[PDB]
Design a protein around this motif. Structure first.
Motif, PDB file in Angstrom:
ATOM      1  N   UNK A  37      -6.550 -10.852  45.067  1.00 60.40           N
ATOM      2  CA  UNK A  37      -5.829  -9.827  44.311  1.00 60.40           C
ATOM      3  C   UNK A  37      -6.016 -10.093  42.819  1.00 60.40           C
ATOM      4  N   UNK A  38      -7.247  -9.886  42.358  1.00 58.40           N
ATOM      5  CA  UNK A  38      -7.551 -10.003  40.942  1.00 58.40           C
ATOM      6  C   UNK A  38      -7.350 -11.386  40.367  1.00 58.40           C
ATOM      7  N   UNK A  39      -7.289 -12.408  41.215  1.00 62.39           N
ATOM      8  CA  UNK A  39      -7.057 -13.754  40.724  1.00 62.39           C
ATOM      9  C   UNK A  39      -5.722 -13.877  40.024  1.00 62.39           C
ATOM     10  N   UNK A  40      -5.727 -14.577  38.893  1.00 62.51           N
ATOM     11  CA  UNK A  40      -4.518 -14.782  38.121  1.00 62.51           C
ATOM     12  C   UNK A  40      -4.769 -15.530  36.831  1.00 62.51           C
ATOM     13  N   UNK A  41      -3.927 -15.294  35.826  1.00 66.06           N
ATOM     14  CA  UNK A  41      -4.130 -15.936  34.539  1.00 66.06           C
ATOM     15  C   UNK A  41      -3.946 -17.440  34.584  1.00 66.06           C
ATOM     16  N   UNK A  42      -2.910 -17.905  35.274  1.00 63.69           N
ATOM     17  CA  UNK A  42      -2.544 -19.322  35.262  1.00 63.69           C
ATOM     18  C   UNK A  42      -3.185 -20.105  36.409  1.00 63.69           C
ATOM     19  N   UNK A  43      -4.503 -19.963  36.554  1.00 66.95           N
ATOM     20  CA  UNK A  43      -5.286 -20.736  37.521  1.00 66.95           C
ATOM     21  C   UNK A  43      -4.780 -20.558  38.951  1.00 66.95           C
ATOM     22  N   UNK A  44      -4.165 -19.415  39.247  1.00 64.17           N
ATOM     23  CA  UNK A  44      -3.622 -19.140  40.574  1.00 64.17           C
ATOM     24  C   UNK A  44      -4.204 -17.825  41.069  1.00 64.17           C
ATOM     25  N   UNK A  45      -5.005 -17.891  42.128  1.00 60.57           N
ATOM     26  CA  UNK A  45      -5.657 -16.720  42.701  1.00 60.57           C
ATOM     27  C   UNK A  45      -4.956 -16.375  44.008  1.00 60.57           C
ATOM     28  N   UNK A  46      -4.419 -15.161  44.088  1.00 52.67           N
ATOM     29  CA  UNK A  46      -3.693 -14.702  45.259  1.00 52.67           C
ATOM     30  C   UNK A  46      -4.546 -13.715  46.054  1.00 52.67           C
ATOM     31  N   UNK A  47      -3.977 -13.214  47.147  1.00 51.18           N
ATOM     32  CA  UNK A  47      -4.640 -12.252  48.018  1.00 51.18           C
ATOM     33  C   UNK A  47      -3.869 -10.942  47.972  1.00 51.18           C
TER      34      UNK A  47
END
Length: 68
Positions: A19-29
């Motif tokens: 889900x578009x990754x994430x700013x704080x080094x956290x990539x979700x689905x």
RNA sequence: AUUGAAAGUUGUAGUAUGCGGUCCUUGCGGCUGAGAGCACUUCAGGAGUUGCCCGCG
């Protein structure tokens, strides 16, 4: 010619359609709201779900791979 | 063939590297299963009996 397929497939240990990754080094689905029966209740749950567009792109890739 | 039509939220990434559950430690010393004790007391292999019977170197 005109073919339609539908079924259930089991898959696990995947990070498909992030889900578009994430700013704080956290990539979700990508998440999906689903309504289901809970013994006389219309409850809602969060489940992963791959978008149709991704399957479209993979089908195009397979078609261009075999057409070579 | 629906304001739908074309479309990867994509590609690359080790929580990894060195780090003794380690060194000392007696299940140790003393301790009579010992002292008393008749397989003893009574007892005939015993009572009967012709090597038996005939005989000219």
């Amino acid at each position: 010619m005109y073919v339609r397929i539908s079924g259930r497939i089991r898959l696990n240990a995947h990070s498909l359609n992030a889900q578009g990754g994430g700013g704080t080094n956290y990539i979700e689905i990508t998440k999906t709201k689903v309504t289901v029966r809970t013994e006389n209740g219309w409850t809602v749950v969060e489940v992963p779900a791959i978008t149709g567009n991704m399957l479209k792109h993979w089908h195009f890739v397979g078609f261009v791979d075999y057409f070579k």
